[PDB]
């Protein structure tokens, strides 16, 4: 499930190509693309 | 606040439908007085789609994250006065989003405690004072300008650059009106003893003999002006003779300006083309309005005896500089200077833009009457249509 957080309500949601770019819990129009459990390698320097 | 004084200073912009009627042909009529009584600014709000939506306070965090300006709706109570009062029309017009200063009396963060401020995703200590324009943080740089309202004695080769018989000596007073709009006034001592006064109108410069502006301010005797300048100083043969050159020279140039009113008629007649008062004002009104708008505006309207006294003080300081009994000052010394604050510049530019906007309405009436003359100043339709035909987005 892709995730997008409301910039002003913190409410998690799962946007679709068929929905309005808006927080369904607040009504804000700014959404942060959520981080997920995804592997990244790092040189410890 | 300063801005309401500014719009009180812009006054009126009148336009006549040449108001036909078929004195109504050489006095005609039907006046239309357009002005702005109040100017209100509202804190940033955003309502959804378009109308009916519940408004929400808009925060700077939003404008920065969004990369947009941080605008407040600019509104102004328009006064549409017809025939000096036959009909007044009030209108609150929205002039687009005016960028508001942070932590100002127009930013939601003006009164937030650090705790709430953090609750709004801000630097717990954010001083503010700057503007979010297209998301880019800009502040208006403060500027060092001549200390207002006080005559600064300057020797400048520009003064000679005016022409023959010009000396270097001169006085510069930067009169600023209550609204902080400025008007620089200069006095020049000619080699001929003549003194000429520099000023600026429609940002073009204009020169007038000072004895004209003196006889224009107040009805007075020649002995009152002479006594105004030299006074008890009866021993300055230097000043006695230069001042006799001045007054006698005016008697040479204008033997026919016998009284102050006639002088005002001469000023109105010579500036009527440019003060845009015509088809409405008499040469007495245009002349007096000029005095009121140019000469020592820091003293204000009806300060005409006081403005007279001050102008005489500048003449005395000018001759004391000429002799050399006093040093000239230094424009570049911090001693002689004051600070144009960014917000004050903001208020001035707003005042000027609202002046142009009303002038723009006047232009819109001119075009309408020049392609149809279809409609009378009374129509409510006319108010809505004309207003909807000029551009009013001063916020942008």
């Amino acid at each position: 499930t892709l995730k997008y957080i409301c910039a002003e309500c913190s409410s998690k949601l799962s946007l679709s190509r068929t929905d309005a770019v808006r927080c369904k819990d607040c009504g804000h129009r700014i959404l942060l693309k959520a981080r997920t459990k995804r592997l990244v390698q790092f040189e410890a320097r | 606040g300063l801005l309401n004084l500014g719009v009180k200073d812009i006054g009126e912009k009148v336009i006549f439908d040449g108001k036909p009627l078929n004195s109504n042909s050489g006095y005609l009529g039907n006046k239309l007085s357009v002005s702005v009584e109040q100017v209100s600014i509202a804190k940033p709000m955003s309502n959804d789609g378009v109308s009916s939506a519940v408004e929400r306070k808009v925060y700077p965090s939003e404008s920065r994250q969004r990369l947009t300006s941080y605008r407040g709706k600019l509104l102004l109570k328009l006064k549409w006065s017809v025939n000096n009062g036959e009909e007044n029309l009030f209108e609150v017009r929205d002039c687009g989003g005016l960028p508001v200063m942070l932590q100002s009396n127009r930013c939601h963060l003006n009164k937030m405690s650090p705790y709430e401020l953090v609750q709004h995703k801000e630097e717990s200590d954010e001083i503010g004072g700057y503007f979010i324009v297209n998301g880019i943080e800009k502040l208006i740089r403060m500027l060092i300008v001549q200390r207002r309202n006080h005559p600064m004695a300057i020797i400048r080769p520009s003064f000679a650059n005016r022409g023959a018989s010009y000396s270097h000596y001169g006085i510069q007073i930067r009169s600023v009106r209550p609204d902080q709009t400025s008007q620089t006034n200069v006095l020049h001592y000619l080699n001929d003893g003549q003194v000429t006064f520099r000023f600026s109108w429609r940002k073009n410069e204009y020169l007038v003999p000072v004895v004209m502006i003196l006889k224009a301010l107040c009805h007075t005797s020649d002995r009152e002006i002479f006594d105004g300048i030299i006074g008890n100083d009866v021993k300055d043969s230097f000043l006695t003779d230069r001042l006799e050159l001045l007054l006698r020279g005016f008697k040479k140039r204008y033997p026919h300006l016998q009284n102050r009113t006639q002088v005002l008629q001469y000023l109105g007649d010579k500036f009527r083309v440019v003060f845009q008062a015509s088809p409405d004002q008499s040469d007495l009104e245009v002349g007096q309005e000029v005095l009121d708008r140019i000469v020592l505006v820091h003293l204000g309207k009806d300060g005409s005896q006081d403005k007279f006294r001050m102008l005489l003080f500048m003449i005395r300081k000018l001759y004391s500089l000429v002799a050399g009994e006093c040093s000239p000052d230094n424009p570049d010394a911090t001693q002689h200077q004051e600070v144009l604050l960014g917000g004050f510049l903001y208020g001035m530019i707003l005042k000027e833009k609202i002046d142009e906007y009303l002038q723009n309405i006047i232009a819109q009436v001119r075009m309408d009457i020049n392609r149809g003359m279809a409609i009378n100043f009374k129509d409510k339709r006319y108010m809505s249509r004309v207003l909807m035909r000029v551009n009013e987005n001063i916020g942008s």
Binding site: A20, R22, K24, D25, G27 | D48, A53, V54
Partner: protein
């Protein structure tokens, strides 16, 4: 979103489905095994048979809100489990049927199939008026040719019981009215469901069996009480029954009859609306907070609107910002006791007073005709005097 024949096919289909949903709550409701289920299925299989034949571009099928319950009604009679008025009141009171709102579907999609000409005109359009409900049953029987197909139609010694207990359940009056029914009530034979009134003007042949049962019921009471020469039913006894009657709570039933009264009809219960005996008021709001919860779920009124609505309901937490009331046979018992002291112009007046009341009750569960009922009454009145 389609017009014509295939629009009709799904209109058809949707009608298909809701009836099936209706039937299974039926089983859970009564729990009367494969039997109730399969008879109902072939009944509509039979109904469908006819629809296909006059097809081509036949769109007369647009069966009504009532067609479905008429179907379940006839199927039940085949089996002969219950009654009509009781079934109807029970159904309205508990919304047992999915009858009144057609959003259930399983269509979300059938909905969008453009409720167009049809499916929109499906599920919950309005409540039954006059014969706007027994007439359809006759039409169904005609298309169905139901009487030939199914046994013992409109029967039920159970409706009589329901009726006596209904109020002045004068144990003896079950046998009284059963006897007059015995009498000229179809030559002492259980009234069968009327025929397939094929004709479209649906005349008041007045053969709907029950309608006549209630008529005999009423008649019996006043005839019986209007010539109890032996004086078996005391003067002061008749008004006592009507007295005790004076409304009262209901272990579910009377609350239901209030819910049916509230279809604001001919103003016989309208005022009950007004009065609404205190709590009756309360258990009413209880049944509203439970059973018009389905009410609904705006979609496409900007998410924002929805949010606002939620907030509103929000700032209205509400729902709470002897188990007390009693069952049916409890109430029945206690008014049977409230009259337990048993052992001229006025009594005639009292008798008329009482009869108007039952007229209210029996009439109120059903399509009434504050005249037809009367017309019905008139009819058998005439039937009777051929001794």
């Amino acid at each position: 979103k389609l017009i014509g024949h295939e629009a009709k096919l799904l209109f058809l289909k949707s009608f298909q489905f809701i009836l099936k949903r209706q039937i299974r709550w039926l089983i859970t409701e009564m729990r009367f095994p494969k039997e109730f289920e399969h008879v109902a299925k072939i009944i509509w299989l039979k109904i469908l048979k006819t629809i296909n034949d006059q097809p081509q571009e036949e769109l007369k099928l647009q069966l009504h809100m009532t067609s479905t319950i008429s179907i379940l009604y006839l199927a039940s009679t085949h089996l002969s489990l219950p009654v009509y008025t009781c079934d109807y009141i029970k159904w309205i009171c508990t919304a047992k049927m999915p009858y009144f709102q057609a959003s259930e579907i399983l269509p979300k999609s059938w909905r969008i199939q453009l409720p167009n000409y049809y499916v929109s005109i499906l599920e919950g359009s309005i409540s039954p008026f006059n014969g706007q409900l027994y007439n359809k049953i006759a039409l169904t029987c005609g298309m169905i040719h139901f009487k030939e197909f199914f046994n013992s139609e409109i029967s039920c010694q159970g409706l009589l019981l329901k009726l006596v207990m209904q109020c002045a359940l004068p144990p003896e009056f079950y046998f009284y009215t059963k006897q007059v029914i015995e009498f000229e009530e179809t030559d002492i034979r259980n009234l069968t469901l009327w025929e397939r009134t094929d004709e479209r003007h649906t005349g008041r042949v007045s053969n709907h069996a029950e309608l006549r049962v209630l008529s005999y019921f009423m008649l019996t009471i006043n005839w019986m009480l209007s010539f109890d020469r032996d004086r078996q039913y005391p003067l002061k006894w008749i008004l006592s029954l009507t007295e005790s009657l004076t409304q009262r709570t209901t272990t579910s039933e009377s609350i239901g009859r209030n819910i049916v009264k509230v279809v604001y009809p001919d103003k016989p219960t309208s005022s009950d609306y007004f009065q609404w005996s205190e709590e009756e008021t309360l258990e009413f709001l209880k049944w509203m907070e439970k059973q018009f919860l389905p009410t609904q779920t705006s979609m496409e009124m900007t998410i924002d609107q929805k949010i606002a609505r939620r907030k509103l309901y929000k700032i209205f937490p509400l729902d709470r910002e002897d188990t007390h009331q009693l069952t049916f046979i409890e109430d029945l018992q206690e008014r049977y006791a409230k009259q337990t002291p048993f052992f001229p112009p006025a009594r005639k007046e009292a008798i008329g007073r009482l009869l108007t009341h039952i007229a209210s009750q029996l009439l109120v569960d059903f399509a009434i005709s504050k005249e037809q009922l009367k017309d019905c009454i008139s009819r058998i009145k005439n039937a009777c005097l051929h001794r």
